[PDB]
Amino acid sequence: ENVWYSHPRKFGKGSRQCRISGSHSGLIRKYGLNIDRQSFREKANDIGFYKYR
Amino acid sequence: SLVVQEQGSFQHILRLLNTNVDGNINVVYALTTIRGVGRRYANLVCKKADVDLHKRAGELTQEELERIVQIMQNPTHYKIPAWFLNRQKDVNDGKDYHSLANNLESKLRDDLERLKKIRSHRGIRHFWGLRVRGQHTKTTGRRRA
Amino acid sequence: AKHAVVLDQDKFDRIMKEAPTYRYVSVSVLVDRFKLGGSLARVALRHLENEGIIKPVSKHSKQAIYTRAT
Amino acid sequence: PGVSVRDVPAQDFINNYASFLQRQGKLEVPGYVDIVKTSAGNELPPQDSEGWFYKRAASVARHIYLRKQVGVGKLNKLYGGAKNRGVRPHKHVDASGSINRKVLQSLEKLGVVEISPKGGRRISDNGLRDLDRIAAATLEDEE
Amino acid sequence: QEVVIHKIRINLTSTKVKQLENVSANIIKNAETFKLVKKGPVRLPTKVLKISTRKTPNGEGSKTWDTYEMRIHKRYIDLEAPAHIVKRITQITIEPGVDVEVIIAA
Amino acid sequence: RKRSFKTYSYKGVDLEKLLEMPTEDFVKLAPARVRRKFARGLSEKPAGLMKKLRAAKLSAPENEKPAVVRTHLRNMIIVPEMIGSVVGVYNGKVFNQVEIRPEMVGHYLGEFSITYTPVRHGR
RNA sequence: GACGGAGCCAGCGAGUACAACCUUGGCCGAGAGGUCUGGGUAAUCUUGUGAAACUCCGUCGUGCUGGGGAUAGAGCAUUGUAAUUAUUGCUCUUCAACGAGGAAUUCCUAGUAAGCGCAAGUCAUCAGCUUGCGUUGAUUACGUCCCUGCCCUUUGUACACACC
Ligand SMILES: [Mg+2]
Ligand SMILES: [Mg+2]
Ligand SMILES: [Mg+2]
Ligand SMILES: [Mg+2]
């Protein structure tokens, strides 16, 4: 309700925020996943990604 | 197919604009020895003059040399677009300027002095003896020269 | 500049009297016996090649080897 | 048995075309000659100066003949190379597009190159004929 | 009444190959039963979706990588039929995992 | 007598010409970056600061220096409309004074403030 | 070899409707870029990613030279609310250190080494980095414990928090 409470956060590491953790660090934004790396790794088979080679 | 001979009728080993513009070097690539005249600019000047580029700087008739000299100091007179110069839009006057030989260095010095007077960051850097263009020096350049 | 490659007329003359019944007639070769080089040696060779004498065998870029007419 | 450009040593053909152009005088030189880079990632303008824009034009024409439809960007891509970016690895940089455009315009004016459906440029019949003639000449020379 | 022959394109997409194949077979069987103008199950180049991750969460260790890849199978079938028939064909023969998609009409 | 050293300019216009021009002229004259900045729609970057400067100018100790205004927009353009008026530019710690010549043409406020204490070991 | 022409061949990719993705083709500009229009949610359009290294003919011929490109100076562009503490792109100018690198020491045995680009990753903008990918493509073993590390066997031990 304050006069302002926001600075422009449309791009950079400020805009992109993870699905699971909300981390701005190590974010996989390829194919529109928006999942940070470790989390993605943990739950990769659930998405359908597999380690073949 | 034929070699253009000349025993030595056109005298070699010349001087133009104070310092040395030597023979056996090409008409364009000996003008590079003159400070301020680089390569492309030199080539342009040569073109303007209308000299053979198969020619040594050691030869050349005097008239041609004079023409070249004329072209050098005042290029906005000629068909040179004048938007590839040192001081275009200028620091003071607002004109297309390209200093040459013993003048460019002086001009640079003057500019530096002006900057120092103003007390801008670059000036301060210069005073110190450091890198102006944000090249961060945790390493790189460790002999003071 | 360490000379050997200038212009002159004596040199040219010498070159001219260095072509019939000859083995080596290249740019490097020319340079070797204190004579012209670059894109002048070739020209010199041609000057003799135009009036018979020297025949071309190889004509690659910045490498050419020549042999006299038998 | 019949002659076409596709049957000729390429460089020689290009040279011939350039010569022909020179003889003609007709093309329209825009007047950027003896000032410009050709590719925006170069250290020098042409080492011939007086001409070779003719040569470029000829090359372009040949390319057009070879293909179906050619544009400006494509031409630039074709003609550009690797710019020395200093103490940094080289990259493909597209050629000066304006020059290419000018060349195309000149060709059009001449009656060699023609604006096509879908987009870009193809060859005119007169242009084709000219090319054929050039090829024939080249062949004759070779003979 | 209704029978005016259109131009029908049917897309099939999955990760499971066998399932997709089964679906295709089913479709072909249906077509045979209805005996219509047919273009075969045209197979499009399988799309491998790549990901590269440092195996570590923290960063310390010998720098080891992962290649998490997801392969997409996309195949299309072309039929000339009335639309109703096509709909009937496609309302059945649905297997979980395979995406059945219809373009319909020219 | 007609010249002492050399009279000072933007890209032509003299000391007296500069003070009475507003911003449009400066925009027209300037280097490219400055021009671009001006083109890009500004809001309250100079709107209040300029007013403050004007106010300062209004009340003066006469032929010296007006009241010191304090800026946080440390990356703001010096146009020849705020000439002479002393302003304090932020660095993190403490505002730093700027005396403005007819030679501070399109230059930033940041190159004047300096946010670090320079190195001292053997220059 | 360098520079100029010209010849002119890839494979992995990636790519937007609630946004602003990839962006041909046409005009304007030496550039960078603009601009109008498009085509594409994609084996369909970008894209044959006509990529570099390369090959062809020319200019310099071994001189800190046209090798080499660092600092610099000035301008013109672009992204973003914001570019000084040059974001970056381009233009002219400046031309520094280095004639193949001591004590050392890394990687490698075949489409490999090495050369060369391209590609996605981060990314509003930035590649000297990274995962891939092709392109060009060798030299030399096809072995041995000499060194280095590891393993085992036999031995000795007053160590078993184990030779710190
Ligand atoms: Mg190089
Ligand atoms: Mg393609
Ligand atoms: Mg130099
Ligand atoms: Mg950065």
Swiss-Prot record, chain A:
Keyword Ribonucleoprotein (UniProt): yes
InterPro entries: Ribosomal_uS14, RIbosomal_uS14_euk_arc, Ribosomal_uS14_sf
GO cellular component: cytosolic small ribosomal subunit
Any single GO BP term: cytoplasmic translation
Superkingdom of the organism of origin: Eukaryota
Keyword Ribosomal protein included in the entry's annotation: yes
Entry keywords, A to Z: Ribonucleoprotein, Ribosomal protein
GO function term, MF aspect, one: structural constituent of ribosome
Protein family: Belongs to the universal ribosomal protein uS14 family.
Alphabetized NCBIfam families for the sequence: PRK05766.1
This protein's name: Small ribosomal subunit protein uS14
Protein's organism: Kluyveromyces lactis (strain ATCC 8585 / CBS 2359 / DSM 70799 / NBRC 1267 / NRRL Y-1140 / WM37) (Yeast)
